[PDB]
Amino acid sequence: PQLHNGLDFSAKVIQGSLDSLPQEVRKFVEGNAQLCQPEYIHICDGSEEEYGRLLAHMQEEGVIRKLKKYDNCWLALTDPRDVARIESKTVIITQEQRDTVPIPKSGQSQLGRWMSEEDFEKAFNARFPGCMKGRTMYVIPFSMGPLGSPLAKIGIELTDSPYVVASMRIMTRMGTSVLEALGDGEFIKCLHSVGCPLPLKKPLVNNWACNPELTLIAHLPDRREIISFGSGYGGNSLLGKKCFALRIASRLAKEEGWLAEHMLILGITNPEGKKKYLAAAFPSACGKTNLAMMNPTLPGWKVECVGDDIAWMKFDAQGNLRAINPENGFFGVAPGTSVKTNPNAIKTIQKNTIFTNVAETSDGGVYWEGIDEPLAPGVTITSWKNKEWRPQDEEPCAHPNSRFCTPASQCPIIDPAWESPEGVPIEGIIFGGRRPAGVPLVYEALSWQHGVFVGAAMRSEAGKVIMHDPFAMRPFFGYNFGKYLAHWLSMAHRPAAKLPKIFHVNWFRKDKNGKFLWPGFGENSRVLEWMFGRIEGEDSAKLTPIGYVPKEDALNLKGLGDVNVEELFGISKEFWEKEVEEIDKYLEDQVNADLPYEIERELRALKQRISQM
Ligand SMILES: Nc1nc2c(ncn2[C@@H]2O[C@H](COP(=O)(O)OP(=O)(O)OP(=O)(O)O)[C@@H](O)[C@H]2O)c(=O)[nH]1
Ligand SMILES: [Cl-]
Ligand SMILES: [Mn+2]
Ligand SMILES: [Mn+2]
Ligand SMILES: [Mn+2]
């Protein structure tokens, strides 16, 4: 219905048809077209043709550069004001603040950022009206998880950024098949704008549209909406990556009885032909992607990658914890990636990959700190700021959190079940962070409840600062962390639930000279071997106040020899007395009235065990 001609946007559709869309999808698209006033509407089909044409268009406009040395690889350099996920501008809107974060006892909550509905309404009206003027609104239908998986969820992202379209094609399952699978079902509404309507009011920097002053990444779980404005970058703009995958999904999981977690999933096979799947939650910069595609050093062992960042997990009727990787690609940190630290990533990213904010070599290759690769004489480097750069300079050639964006199907060790709609059965969950002192290489939680406490007590080095990052989810909780703990704990009362063993690792313990005690990377297969046997029930553990650690000689150290096991597994009363005190202060303040009894009990129990050593 229409008294004039400003409500039907059919005349502006340059690919697809509004009449083809499911009724509620059409209302989403047309309502925001009316608000944002795009010049064109492009309904993405996900085809190779649309993808290649969009890439070529971005190339002609200077938005991306083709990397000549590789096969269909591309480089985007951003406005340096728009280089990362920005927590201070990431908010969750609920009626009551207590649904989004626990009310802290004394301090400010660091477990989330709540915004009232009225405040968001003002912010929204100050940003989105007319924000796509002169631009194409792309409609991205995408599936989080294998199409038709019982654990998959569907989203529709509206964006004015072709960079987002290309990246979402890699990181999600995108296109016409998703719309047909959606039918009249439920979907998450995702609205994104870089916030630079034409004609441009402010200078465009590095051909990268963004609006840093007005950047705001909002989540409305009760409306099943994600609304992001002002950033074109990564987790701010690829709304499946963190906004859907963790923040919205963790609320859905709370309501529906499953788990959405900042975890890799890997499958490990031992020399006896036995295969187990493990999940691991490490904070950013703590090596999930290295572990997920590890090249094991132990002969006869094999590791295969299901996902490197996000896990959606649900106990099935048989009681197995079944996990899917809801992503379709890897959005990995580039700096530090080398043949030594991640050879399988190096193989994956040389075709069909989009790089953002890395350096470019004069022969059309990529470069970054820690690449640990020499360049032939004559080869020169352009920094991520589009300036000539030489290794004898201070500033980095690549942004510290520059990324590659690569299809998961290309990983040479992608797991054969990485797209299985039923998911893979998780037998162990690993927590870990950067702890230069005090925390052993590996230990095993004494019970599910103790394991949940271990996840809750996770800390990690940021002068050095040791921060709290419970479950590696501190930036990503979609709801009250205290209820999230209760949700985890409630899994132990499920029907026939086969609870995975929980472990905590530390690759980063250092000696008094600051050298790593453990070589890490592929040598972490030796730690996975110990976990593997522990899941099988092997008698390879000794009890300590913090949990089980490997017996003397239980860890396979053949081929190392120069490793200080006593210091690596040293457990100091002095350190752990201070550690439990800090955990106690943290949980009391930050979780306060929503701290489950079982977690307080595990804290008291650990305090008591440490007091007796
Ligand atoms: N010493 C040591 N460092 C490691 C090991 N594994 C990974 N790293 C370091 O971890 C960093 C890479 O971590 P990231 O890619 O940022 O970790 P991530 O968990 O994948 O982070 P996100 O992609 O943001 O979720 C580099 O500094 C690596 O050197 C290890 O076993 N030992
Ligand atoms: Cl354009
Ligand atoms: Mn990663
Ligand atoms: Mn991550
Ligand atoms: Mn309980």
Residue numbers in the entry: 3 to 464, 472 to 622
Copied sentences from the primary study:
As the unmixed and Δt ≃ 40 ms data are isomorphous, maps corresponding to F o,mixed − F o,unmixed can be calculated. These show clear hallmarks of GTP to GDP conversion, with relaxation of the α- and β-phosphates away from the Mn2+ catalytic ions [Figs. 2(a) and 2(b)]. As the Δt ≃ 120 ms data are no longer isomorphous to the unmixed data, we cannot use as sensitive a method for analysis, but general inspection of the data suggests that little has changed in the active site between 40 and 120 ms.
